[PDB]
Amino acid sequence: TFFNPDREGWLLKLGGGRVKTWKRRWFILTDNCLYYFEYTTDKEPRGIIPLENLSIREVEDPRKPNCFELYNPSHKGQVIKACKTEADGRVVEGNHVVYRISAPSPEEKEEWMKSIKASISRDPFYDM
């Protein structure tokens, strides 16, 4: 799956739960999904966030620079389809309405946003 990726790189991801903490993950954009790994050479992704139907927007954050958000525009407060692993082996659906992401630089933010937008638009099943 991870052959011929559209982009890879480090991003920070804000965790979707009650306290919410930032975690540094290695992301791979491929097959119109964002896969993320704890460490770059990990065999198994920690999660997958399919991009189909999603949109992207810039946001400003109090603590993290170079941020954007993925969200589902079709319905407000709609949960984003996604899946992750837990250390005990559970494979669970995500519970995010938004994914806030911080890129390592303004340049990388622009590159990631452009790559994500292009991937969403190339999907032949986009907006259906």
Domain that holds residue 100: 1-128
Domain count for the chain: 1
Residues shown for the chain: 128
Whether residue 51 contacts residue 70, with contact meaning beta carbons closer than 8 Å, is answered with yes
CA–CA distance from 100 to each of 1, 2, 44, 87 (Å)?
Answer: 25, 23, 22, 23
CATH code for position 124: 2.30.29.30
The residue with tokens 């896969």 is 35
Whether residue 48 contacts residue 40, with contact meaning beta carbons closer than 8 Å, is answered with no
**What resolution in angstroms, rounded to 1 decimal?**
1.8
Annotated binding-site ranges:
13-14, 16-21, 25, 36, 46, 95
Structure tokens at 30: 């491929």
Query: DSSP 3-state assignment of 103?
Result: coil
Q: H helices of the chain, where? A: 106-122
Whether residue 35 contacts residue 13, with contact meaning beta carbons closer than 8 Å, is answered with no
Burial class (CB in 10 A: 0-12, 13-18, 19+), 22: middle
The H or E element spanning position 25 is strand 22-30
Q: Which amino acid is at 98?
A: V
